[PDB]
Amino acid sequence: STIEEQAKTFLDKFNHEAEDLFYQSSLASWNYNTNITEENVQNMNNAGDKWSAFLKEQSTLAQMYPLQEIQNLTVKLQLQALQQNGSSVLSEDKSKRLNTILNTMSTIYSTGKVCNPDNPQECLLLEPGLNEIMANSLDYNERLWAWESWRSEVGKQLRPLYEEYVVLKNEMARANHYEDYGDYWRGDYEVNGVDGYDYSRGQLIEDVEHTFEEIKPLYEHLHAYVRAKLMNAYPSYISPIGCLPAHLLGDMWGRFWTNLYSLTVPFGQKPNIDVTDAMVDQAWDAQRIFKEAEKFFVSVGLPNMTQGFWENSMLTDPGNVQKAVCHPTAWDLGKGDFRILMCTKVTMDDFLTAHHEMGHIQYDMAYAAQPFLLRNGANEGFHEAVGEIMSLSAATPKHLKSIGLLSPDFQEDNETEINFLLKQALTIVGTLPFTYMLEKWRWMVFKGEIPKDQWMKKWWEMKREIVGVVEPVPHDETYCDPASLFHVSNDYSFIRYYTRTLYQFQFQEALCQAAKHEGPLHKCDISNSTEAGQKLFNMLRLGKSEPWTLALENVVGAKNMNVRPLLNYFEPLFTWLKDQNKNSFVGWSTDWSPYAD
Amino acid sequence: SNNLDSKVGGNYNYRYRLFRKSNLKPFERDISTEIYQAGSKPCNGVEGFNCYFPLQSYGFQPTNGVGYQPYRVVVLSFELLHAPATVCGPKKSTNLV
């Protein structure tokens, strides 16, 4: 009768055909990751190309239904996915050139290497060679050579390729009614047509700016703690008031301080929680670790797994002849068929990794009943943040003592919790401004505020101001540091890490309140709390059918990102950092550099 | 019947209707392939803008879940009519004293 039946009928036609087609590509990827061969990679690529072609052919009818007078949010969200053209707006020459740029940029990133000036015949590749130098090795020269030569060998080669990527992508986004490809990434959280829950694209830039100022009190104290500790290892290069060198952060990109835990132990004489021996003594295996991990999910009140889930999952690498991908990855094969790939070992490192991938399944399995176009997450933050809150509560010693891994005689004290708490801050607190730094720089590059020649100049400027980091050797305009990152060269969004981090503690504070927990969040454990899982499943089942702000309003107590649950998590850490920073300077000084004279 | 009716690629022999111009009656059967016309324009026997082919096949693949696997369903409708009765189950019988 009316026009409404066209969209309601067409989406049902797409949701029927695109469902099996998408699964044919997903199961083909499962078959490839389970057996890396020449036949499976072709089935994976032939299936993906087939489904991708189906999306463009269906966009013809999607654009013939204007959403101007339509108030149905379900019809609006589903058609907007197909109504957009994306890279199809430009000619094949510009689209093919873009793919050649990313394929060329990804290859130069993967094939990077550095050998010593004294030993040219042993050049170490990006992985595992150079990564261990920034992570494990404590030598000042090995970390400096790996950093500077990487920027010269890989950073310079990726500088010119990054130009057409920014230029070609800006033309793509601008044709799709965007300001730039930076705003294109900000469109993920877009919400239009809802009273009290609308969200503009530019609001993300204000959220990271506001929350960064609220993270600064915790970041400035930890930075002084890390500088004071690293100054003991490198006193002839690090000033007690200056900045931290870039090659002493812990990685080849300056994102995490997790590798600096050995150099920044709060109490190297006190013990820590580790059940690697308890599981081996209790005769645990890859299946029992997963099976006992499921008891945590059912205890909190979340749905249990099926027989097809466990029977068809991968627990180990099936030989070198049929070598599978041992990377943890939660798979949604479709039609209720969910599986996980992991080469699990008996250790606490894989104990929490099991809950992480199992947490991803609880996300996807919740909204599995939604339509195909709506059977996805509302944003990038909700996908990965829900997986961490379940594993972190499992890492709490209260759960381990209940299951029987950590013995009950283990003493718990504030001195011991700071070891686990500050180790986490090196990963969280030492990463929050770095993502805000990168995405702020990248967002300005897509918009065009920073000239192409001033990349290294403005990048080094932001490093001293935002994070307080300085390079080991000065770089001229021919360098391009952030383009050498995996997410940048492979066309990925890194702002999700910042949003996922703040969303992680927001959901944790919501579930810790659902567990009737008191005190800081670092000692929180939601085990055996049936209301905890019930509160989460009410949110996971939404998928992308409702606004993302609505899921946060009735769960975590806000519509945007917030630092309130971060400080409560690191509440006693702020006191500890305050005492250790008594003989140092909170914050940093942009006038100091390791190559100063 | 997942181990019996499921087929690699989907059992295309078992199909079903997604849309119809009117709601069926109790125990009604309609196997027409008429195009569901929503707008004032004619479908001319082909789907498109405001037109849709109402029948589609099932995706009964062996990898389906409990909610999508095939289930051999049978409905048993009874009729209490003025006409005489014809069939009831076996009556108990015992020894002869």
XYZ file of C-alpha atoms in Angstrom:
694
model
C 0.000 0.000 0.000
C 2.370 2.682 1.276
C 6.086 3.126 0.626
C 6.870 1.582 4.033
C 6.224 -1.929 2.695
C 9.042 -1.515 0.153
C 11.783 -1.066 2.760
C 10.220 -3.636 5.097
C 10.036 -6.134 2.226
C 13.405 -5.325 0.636
C 15.301 -5.559 3.929
C 13.709 -8.958 4.545
C 14.939 -10.040 1.107
C 18.447 -8.809 1.926
C 18.395 -10.205 5.468
C 17.530 -13.619 4.003
C 20.082 -13.737 1.181
C 22.905 -11.765 2.815
C 22.675 -14.009 5.890
C 23.801 -17.219 4.178
C 26.215 -15.355 1.889
C 27.968 -13.663 4.819
C 28.225 -16.989 6.646
C 29.720 -18.646 3.559
C 32.583 -16.149 3.827
C 32.860 -16.569 7.602
C 32.985 -20.378 7.586
C 35.482 -20.200 4.719
C 37.692 -18.025 6.922
C 37.279 -20.575 9.719
C 38.316 -23.343 7.321
C 41.373 -21.305 6.315
C 42.475 -20.396 9.845
C 42.023 -24.037 10.920
C 44.082 -25.364 7.977
C 46.391 -22.842 6.283
C 46.564 -24.174 2.710
C 46.395 -22.888 -0.858
C 42.892 -24.288 -1.416
C 41.282 -22.716 1.658
C 42.650 -19.206 1.084
C 41.043 -19.269 -2.372
C 37.706 -20.371 -0.906
C 38.077 -17.596 1.676
C 38.793 -14.944 -0.961
C 36.266 -16.231 -3.504
C 33.576 -16.251 -0.811
C 34.405 -12.772 0.480
C 34.489 -11.288 -3.014
C 31.149 -12.960 -3.764
C 29.415 -11.514 -0.698
C 31.035 -8.110 -1.245
C 29.571 -7.979 -4.758
C 26.137 -8.809 -3.329
C 26.299 -5.706 -1.127
C 26.838 -3.315 -4.043
C 24.139 -4.888 -6.220
C 21.622 -4.456 -3.388
C 22.477 -0.767 -2.888
C 20.501 0.096 -6.043
C 17.145 -0.500 -4.339
C 18.393 0.854 -0.996
C 18.858 4.366 -2.414
C 15.365 4.336 -3.989
C 13.742 4.696 -0.519
C 14.369 8.182 0.938
C 14.574 8.233 4.734
C 13.513 11.895 4.943
C 9.903 11.367 6.080
C 10.619 7.985 7.739
C 10.559 7.831 11.548
C 11.123 4.056 11.914
C 14.591 3.724 13.432
C 14.815 0.068 12.378
C 14.277 0.878 8.694
C 16.623 3.877 8.863
C 19.611 2.079 10.395
C 19.445 -0.941 8.081
C 19.178 0.981 4.801
C 21.894 3.482 5.746
C 24.410 0.620 5.758
C 23.693 -0.155 2.083
C 22.729 3.329 0.860
C 26.323 4.497 1.365
C 28.691 3.808 -1.534
C 32.032 4.202 0.240
C 34.981 3.627 -2.078
C 32.653 3.194 -5.086
C 32.290 6.989 -5.403
C 35.685 7.337 -7.140
C 36.893 5.831 -10.396
C 38.577 2.436 -10.571
C 41.963 4.129 -11.003
C 41.667 5.945 -7.667
C 40.209 2.886 -5.924
C 42.868 0.542 -7.314
C 45.598 3.036 -6.404
C 44.271 3.161 -2.835
C 44.465 -0.630 -2.546
C 47.986 -0.582 -3.994
C 48.973 2.039 -1.408
C 47.698 -0.014 1.533
C 49.166 -3.234 0.128
C 52.462 -1.407 -0.415
C 52.307 0.296 2.988
C 51.495 -2.967 4.775
C 54.386 -4.795 3.095
C 56.954 -2.130 4.008
C 55.703 -2.248 7.605
C 55.924 -6.039 7.865
C 59.296 -6.332 6.092
C 61.090 -3.696 8.181
C 64.369 -4.655 9.822
C 67.379 -3.180 11.631
C 70.951 -4.417 12.072
C 73.579 -2.892 14.330
C 76.231 -0.531 12.898
C 78.841 -3.004 14.209
C 77.093 -6.188 12.962
C 75.415 -5.561 9.587
C 75.106 -9.300 8.844
C 72.352 -9.878 11.475
C 69.355 -7.631 10.736
C 66.342 -8.419 12.905
C 62.870 -8.376 11.359
C 59.889 -6.539 12.860
C 58.452 -9.664 14.525
C 59.826 -11.377 16.720
C 63.240 -9.718 16.413
C 62.897 -5.969 16.921
C 59.865 -6.337 19.204
C 61.967 -8.152 21.814
C 64.574 -5.371 21.709
C 62.063 -2.730 22.819
C 60.248 -5.153 25.157
C 62.863 -7.414 26.786
C 66.300 -5.904 26.131
C 67.411 -3.194 28.564
C 70.431 -2.008 26.538
C 70.323 1.710 25.750
C 71.985 1.301 22.350
C 69.909 -1.652 21.123
C 66.670 0.173 21.940
C 67.959 3.386 20.340
C 69.193 1.719 17.144
C 65.926 -0.187 16.727
C 63.919 3.028 17.129
C 65.919 5.456 14.985
C 66.713 3.069 12.121
C 63.069 1.957 12.050
C 61.973 5.575 11.601
C 64.579 6.078 8.867
C 64.114 2.781 7.009
C 60.339 2.316 7.424
C 59.101 5.730 8.547
C 60.555 7.577 5.564
C 59.321 5.011 3.033
C 55.776 5.177 4.452
C 55.696 9.003 4.471
C 55.012 9.421 0.709
C 52.576 6.494 0.558
C 50.562 8.003 3.420
C 49.873 11.133 1.347
C 47.738 9.524 -1.366
C 46.038 7.412 1.307
C 44.923 10.588 3.090
C 44.169 12.328 -0.214
C 42.289 9.442 -1.843
C 40.333 8.658 1.330
C 39.337 12.304 1.826
C 37.871 12.326 -1.685
C 36.006 9.116 -0.833
C 34.587 10.450 2.438
C 33.741 13.875 0.993
C 31.597 12.275 -1.718
C 29.754 10.346 1.029
C 28.711 13.587 2.807
C 31.608 13.861 5.274
C 34.145 16.552 6.102
C 37.104 14.147 5.859
C 38.126 10.550 6.501
C 38.748 11.616 10.092
C 35.076 12.519 10.401
C 34.335 9.254 8.572
C 35.761 7.328 11.529
C 33.777 9.565 13.892
C 30.576 8.546 12.073
C 30.613 5.148 13.802
C 28.937 6.638 16.903
C 26.505 8.749 14.854
C 22.899 8.882 16.078
C 20.168 10.906 14.356
C 16.411 10.970 14.867
C 16.184 10.208 18.612
C 15.123 12.663 21.310
C 17.716 13.022 24.058
C 20.068 10.467 22.453
C 21.257 12.109 19.219
C 25.024 12.257 18.737
C 26.962 14.424 16.293
C 30.176 13.278 14.636
C 32.209 16.163 16.068
C 31.264 15.295 19.656
C 33.931 12.565 19.751
C 36.689 15.180 19.444
C 35.274 16.985 22.489
C 34.936 13.793 24.546
C 38.578 12.739 24.172
C 39.666 16.323 24.889
C 37.545 16.579 28.046
C 38.414 13.112 29.367
C 42.120 13.648 28.641
C 42.195 16.597 31.048
C 40.563 14.352 33.658
C 43.127 11.602 32.976
C 46.052 14.067 33.288
C 46.112 14.076 37.142
C 46.583 10.291 37.097
C 48.861 10.341 34.042
C 51.187 13.098 35.274
C 51.850 11.199 38.512
C 52.539 7.871 36.790
C 54.773 9.564 34.207
C 56.876 11.001 37.034
C 56.981 7.541 38.617
C 58.128 5.942 35.357
C 60.654 8.727 34.744
C 62.038 8.405 38.278
C 62.382 4.635 37.861
C 63.836 4.780 34.342
C 66.206 7.548 35.469
C 67.837 5.008 37.788
C 68.556 2.767 34.787
C 69.506 5.671 32.470
C 70.635 8.592 34.660
C 73.044 10.021 32.060
C 70.144 10.525 29.592
C 66.917 11.048 31.599
C 66.463 14.216 33.650
C 64.474 14.064 36.926
C 62.233 16.887 35.609
C 62.499 16.342 31.839
C 60.675 14.003 29.471
C 60.877 10.262 28.868
C 62.773 9.208 25.700
C 60.692 7.584 22.981
C 62.911 4.507 22.576
C 62.487 3.613 26.293
C 58.683 3.259 26.277
C 58.522 -0.521 25.720
C 57.591 -0.970 22.034
C 58.449 0.196 18.512
C 55.466 2.612 18.416
C 55.179 4.153 21.894
C 51.745 2.903 22.973
C 52.204 0.843 26.162
C 54.419 0.761 29.241
C 53.578 -2.905 29.923
C 57.158 -3.898 29.053
C 58.544 -1.435 31.640
C 57.073 -3.377 34.584
C 60.433 -5.051 35.226
C 62.088 -1.620 35.496
C 59.162 -0.130 37.489
C 58.329 -2.763 40.134
C 56.590 -1.124 43.150
C 57.655 -3.967 45.469
C 60.004 -6.522 43.926
C 60.119 -8.456 47.229
C 56.368 -9.124 47.654
C 54.516 -11.946 45.842
C 51.857 -11.738 43.136
C 48.837 -13.838 42.110
C 49.749 -16.604 39.659
C 47.990 -19.966 39.275
C 50.247 -21.370 36.529
C 51.460 -24.021 38.984
C 48.065 -24.643 40.601
C 46.522 -25.635 37.263
C 49.451 -27.901 36.363
C 49.301 -29.516 39.807
C 45.517 -29.956 39.509
C 45.952 -31.749 36.137
C 44.169 -29.064 34.125
C 44.151 -29.033 30.320
C 42.975 -26.736 27.530
C 39.419 -28.077 27.778
C 39.144 -27.876 31.575
C 40.425 -24.285 31.505
C 37.674 -23.386 29.040
C 35.113 -25.572 30.818
C 35.865 -24.143 34.262
C 35.836 -20.689 32.658
C 32.260 -21.348 31.522
C 31.325 -21.886 35.177
C 32.175 -18.220 35.759
C 29.798 -17.132 32.990
C 26.910 -19.298 34.212
C 27.496 -18.292 37.842
C 27.097 -14.573 37.063
C 23.796 -15.326 35.293
C 24.766 -15.302 31.580
C 23.686 -17.998 29.079
C 25.683 -21.217 28.914
C 27.307 -22.631 25.773
C 26.051 -25.331 23.419
C 27.488 -28.726 22.522
C 28.390 -27.530 19.026
C 30.321 -24.666 20.616
C 32.755 -26.908 22.502
C 32.776 -29.921 20.173
C 33.961 -28.007 17.081
C 36.296 -25.497 18.765
C 40.092 -25.628 18.480
C 42.274 -26.236 21.549
C 45.749 -26.787 20.045
C 47.708 -26.490 16.798
C 46.967 -29.662 14.742
C 50.528 -30.344 13.632
C 52.695 -28.413 11.200
C 51.196 -30.126 8.136
C 47.800 -28.547 8.915
C 49.070 -25.616 10.979
C 46.204 -23.443 12.217
C 46.161 -19.838 13.399
C 46.801 -19.956 17.149
C 45.715 -16.323 17.562
C 42.755 -15.838 19.950
C 39.750 -14.949 17.806
C 36.039 -15.278 18.547
C 34.166 -16.497 15.468
C 30.499 -16.065 14.537
C 29.981 -18.744 11.888
C 26.231 -18.044 11.856
C 22.948 -19.920 12.323
C 23.792 -20.133 16.018
C 27.166 -21.745 15.211
C 29.770 -19.994 17.385
C 33.370 -21.125 17.870
C 36.751 -19.881 19.114
C 40.281 -20.521 17.825
C 43.048 -20.753 20.420
C 46.127 -22.890 21.088
C 45.613 -22.919 24.856
C 48.370 -23.782 27.335
C 48.165 -24.452 31.072
C 49.026 -20.984 32.390
C 47.270 -17.949 33.840
C 48.063 -16.002 30.653
C 45.717 -18.282 28.694
C 43.263 -18.499 31.613
C 42.267 -14.848 31.179
C 42.612 -15.016 27.388
C 39.933 -17.720 27.437
C 37.493 -15.423 29.245
C 38.300 -12.644 26.767
C 37.311 -14.675 23.700
C 34.382 -16.241 25.559
C 33.306 -12.703 26.445
C 33.286 -11.801 22.752
C 30.894 -14.694 22.098
C 28.539 -13.466 24.827
C 28.406 -10.164 22.945
C 27.517 -11.742 19.597
C 25.269 -14.499 20.974
C 23.127 -11.937 22.813
C 21.874 -10.036 19.739
C 21.907 -13.122 17.491
C 18.114 -12.869 17.066
C 18.280 -9.361 15.567
C 18.046 -8.824 11.786
C 21.191 -9.535 9.783
C 22.026 -5.876 9.163
C 21.311 -5.217 12.864
C 23.118 -8.380 14.065
C 26.249 -6.411 14.924
C 27.617 -4.171 17.646
C 26.516 -0.583 18.123
C 30.148 0.570 18.001
C 33.742 -0.575 18.361
C 33.862 0.129 22.097
C 31.070 -2.248 23.090
C 32.692 -5.121 21.177
C 36.068 -5.351 22.936
C 35.245 -3.634 26.246
C 32.781 -6.307 27.387
C 35.459 -8.981 26.947
C 37.892 -7.346 29.368
C 35.471 -6.804 32.270
C 34.788 -10.550 32.467
C 38.479 -11.494 32.400
C 39.517 -8.810 34.903
C 36.969 -9.998 37.473
C 38.314 -13.514 36.904
C 41.854 -12.267 37.574
C 40.696 -11.095 41.012
C 41.942 -13.520 43.718
C 38.407 -13.858 45.118
C 37.365 -15.927 42.090
C 40.547 -18.023 42.072
C 40.157 -18.917 45.753
C 36.548 -19.962 45.110
C 37.358 -22.159 42.103
C 40.298 -23.649 44.013
C 43.302 -22.441 41.982
C 44.757 -19.777 44.295
C 45.179 -21.320 47.728
C 43.170 -19.679 50.555
C 46.297 -19.089 52.677
C 47.569 -16.457 50.218
C 47.816 -13.168 52.105
C 46.337 -10.024 50.542
C 47.737 -6.607 51.440
C 47.780 -3.101 49.975
C 51.483 -3.517 49.172
C 50.635 -6.571 47.050
C 47.686 -4.972 45.237
C 49.796 -2.003 44.102
C 52.001 -4.480 42.225
C 49.003 -5.724 40.236
C 47.314 -2.315 40.145
C 50.298 -0.297 38.904
C 51.173 -3.032 36.388
C 47.723 -2.449 34.885
C 48.139 1.337 34.872
C 51.246 0.939 32.704
C 48.924 -0.687 30.148
C 45.858 1.531 30.722
C 47.129 4.818 32.148
C 50.234 4.599 29.958
C 48.056 4.225 26.830
C 45.055 6.555 27.250
C 46.767 9.831 26.184
C 48.822 8.101 23.472
C 45.681 7.107 21.563
C 44.266 10.597 22.130
C 47.577 11.914 20.789
C 47.585 9.760 17.649
C 43.929 10.142 16.657
C 44.056 13.895 17.303
C 47.070 14.076 14.985
C 45.486 11.794 12.379
C 42.136 13.607 12.553
C 43.909 16.890 11.799
C 45.752 15.248 8.894
C 42.549 14.085 7.191
C 40.927 17.486 7.744
C 44.061 19.159 6.380
C 45.017 21.391 9.331
C 48.602 20.045 9.435
C 50.581 20.416 6.166
C 52.111 17.282 4.684
C 55.640 18.589 5.341
C 54.906 19.504 8.991
C 53.931 15.945 9.997
C 57.100 15.211 11.971
C 57.272 18.771 13.325
C 53.709 18.723 14.672
C 54.007 15.068 15.715
C 57.099 15.779 17.822
C 55.370 18.879 19.202
C 52.315 16.877 20.283
C 54.592 14.257 21.851
C 56.199 16.794 24.191
C 52.900 18.489 25.063
C 50.351 15.674 25.371
C 52.392 12.665 26.530
C 55.722 14.303 27.401
C 57.865 12.033 25.201
C 60.942 13.037 23.185
C 62.739 11.269 20.359
C 66.278 9.893 20.850
C 67.547 11.556 17.640
C 65.938 14.668 16.066
C 63.952 14.008 12.887
C 63.554 16.398 9.957
C 60.477 16.836 7.736
C 61.297 13.705 5.684
C 60.219 11.416 8.561
C 56.742 10.083 9.359
C 56.515 8.187 12.648
C 52.777 7.445 13.182
C 52.355 6.111 9.629
C 54.535 3.125 10.627
C 51.791 1.826 12.949
C 49.872 -1.338 12.080
C 46.446 0.281 12.436
C 47.465 3.273 10.291
C 49.057 1.399 7.380
C 46.267 -1.227 7.292
C 43.476 1.410 7.354
C 42.161 0.786 10.877
C 40.713 3.082 13.530
C 42.730 3.413 16.739
C 40.230 5.636 18.598
C 38.356 2.460 19.578
C 41.199 1.680 22.002
C 40.560 4.951 23.851
C 36.792 4.407 23.838
C 37.112 0.724 24.762
C 39.365 1.594 27.708
C 37.022 4.120 29.324
C 34.015 1.931 28.503
C 35.752 -1.014 30.195
C 35.783 0.600 33.641
C 32.326 2.088 33.038
C 30.822 -1.371 32.519
C 32.940 -2.728 35.381
C 31.600 -0.058 37.742
C 28.091 -0.954 36.566
C 28.548 -4.693 37.144
C 30.516 -4.181 40.365
C 27.490 -2.221 41.569
C 25.385 -5.124 40.287
C 27.573 -7.360 42.471
C 26.915 -5.067 45.480
C 30.651 -4.353 45.624
C 32.193 -1.679 47.858
C 35.559 0.059 47.724
C 37.849 0.522 44.723
C 37.207 -1.514 41.590
C 40.623 -3.224 41.458
C 39.516 -5.731 44.138
C 36.147 -6.322 42.455
C 34.878 -9.833 41.733
C 31.441 -10.542 40.251
C 31.664 -14.315 40.807
C 28.517 -16.089 42.042
C 26.382 -12.948 41.480
C 23.413 -13.973 39.328
C 22.213 -10.361 39.039
C 25.569 -9.305 37.556
C 25.241 -11.342 34.363
C 21.540 -10.535 34.058
C 22.279 -6.800 33.991
C 24.871 -7.264 31.239
C 22.757 -9.537 29.027
C 20.028 -6.882 29.017
C 22.566 -4.615 27.261
C 24.309 -7.171 25.030
C 21.045 -8.188 23.338
C 20.563 -4.699 21.854
C 23.289 -5.068 19.225
C 23.015 -2.035 16.944
C 19.202 -1.800 16.878
C 19.092 1.024 19.474
C 21.272 4.074 20.200
C 24.580 3.337 21.901
C 24.025 6.212 24.344
C 20.826 4.517 25.542
C 22.768 1.380 26.493
C 25.125 3.527 28.581
C 22.443 5.747 30.138
C 20.632 2.895 31.911
C 23.751 0.798 32.723
C 26.858 2.890 33.438
C 25.177 6.219 34.248
C 26.285 8.405 31.331
C 25.838 8.977 27.597
C 29.518 9.522 26.670
C 32.976 8.571 27.913
C 33.911 9.358 31.510
C 37.006 9.150 33.721
C 35.017 8.719 36.981
C 35.344 4.882 37.045
C 39.030 5.106 36.071
C 40.011 7.068 39.183
C 37.981 4.769 41.441
C 39.847 1.812 39.930
C 43.224 3.519 40.466
C 42.204 5.306 43.685
C 44.933 3.893 45.996
C 47.426 4.056 43.112
C 47.141 7.856 43.114
C 48.205 7.844 46.765
C 51.134 5.503 46.074
C 52.330 7.560 43.102
C 52.027 10.666 45.287
C 54.532 9.317 47.824
C 57.061 7.994 45.304
C 56.873 11.276 43.355
C 57.930 13.269 46.443
C 61.553 13.199 45.205
C 60.558 13.943 41.586
C 58.405 16.360 39.560
C 54.803 15.553 38.667
C 54.264 15.992 34.934
C 57.095 16.757 32.519
C 59.206 19.515 30.967
C 59.318 19.949 27.189
C 62.778 21.603 27.275
C 64.723 18.383 27.997
C 65.841 15.828 25.413
C 68.251 12.866 25.648
C 70.447 14.348 22.889
C 70.657 17.719 24.665
C 74.005 19.409 25.281
C 15.849 -33.672 11.132
C 19.245 -31.959 10.835
C 20.980 -35.306 10.257
C 18.306 -36.218 7.651
C 17.007 -33.110 5.842
C 19.993 -30.746 6.067
C 22.066 -30.480 2.889
C 25.313 -28.721 2.017
C 24.240 -25.473 0.367
C 20.767 -25.520 1.940
C 17.793 -27.793 1.271
C 16.204 -25.784 -1.541
C 13.343 -28.307 -1.848
C 11.705 -27.066 1.388
C 10.516 -23.486 0.817
C 8.091 -21.065 2.440
C 6.235 -17.798 1.906
C 7.461 -14.521 3.422
C 4.712 -12.109 2.307
C 1.136 -12.399 1.071
C -1.497 -9.892 -0.025
C -3.870 -11.231 2.655
C -3.812 -13.420 5.744
C -4.634 -17.088 5.257
C -7.573 -18.855 6.904
C -7.373 -21.800 9.329
C -6.009 -24.829 7.453
C -5.825 -22.851 4.200
C -3.368 -23.671 1.410
C -2.059 -21.212 -1.192
C 0.761 -22.169 -3.574
C 0.485 -19.181 -5.928
C 3.605 -17.403 -7.198
C 1.860 -14.028 -7.558
C 4.145 -11.043 -7.012
C 3.376 -9.092 -3.841
C 2.455 -5.661 -5.228
C 2.763 -2.928 -2.589
C 2.506 0.221 -4.719
C 0.211 1.401 -7.486
C 2.683 0.441 -10.232
C 2.374 -3.011 -11.858
C 4.931 -5.707 -11.116
C 4.516 -7.296 -14.589
C 5.481 -10.660 -13.111
C 8.899 -9.395 -11.942
C 9.958 -8.010 -8.580
C 11.560 -4.642 -7.901
C 10.390 -1.253 -6.645
C 7.373 -2.021 -4.421
C 7.269 -5.598 -5.770
C 8.559 -8.834 -4.247
C 8.538 -12.530 -5.087
C 6.836 -13.947 -1.965
C 8.414 -17.438 -1.870
C 11.962 -18.207 -0.734
C 13.875 -21.394 0.002
C 15.125 -22.504 3.410
C 18.780 -22.403 4.416
C 18.736 -25.887 5.961
C 22.494 -26.451 6.026
C 24.140 -29.061 8.302
C 25.896 -26.291 10.269
C 22.592 -24.762 11.422
C 21.769 -24.253 15.086
C 18.850 -25.316 17.238
C 16.883 -22.257 16.095
C 17.574 -22.721 12.363
C 17.899 -26.494 11.924
C 15.098 -28.383 10.137
C 12.329 -29.939 12.226
C 9.857 -32.438 10.770
C 6.640 -31.001 12.234
C 3.239 -32.706 12.010
C -0.044 -31.189 13.226
C -2.925 -33.500 14.176
C -6.319 -31.807 13.795
C -9.379 -33.653 15.111
C -13.042 -33.196 14.182
C -16.058 -33.875 16.416
C -18.876 -34.156 13.869
C -22.490 -35.297 14.003
C -21.459 -38.183 11.738
C -20.388 -41.379 13.555
C -16.906 -41.900 14.935
C -14.301 -44.072 13.216
C -11.019 -44.418 15.163
C -9.948 -44.690 18.787
C -6.991 -46.423 20.340
C -6.735 -49.975 21.575
C -8.903 -51.104 24.463
C -7.359 -53.137 27.246
C -7.921 -56.890 27.266
C -7.035 -59.476 29.899
C -7.286 -63.216 30.501
C -10.520 -65.236 30.467
C -11.637 -66.751 33.779
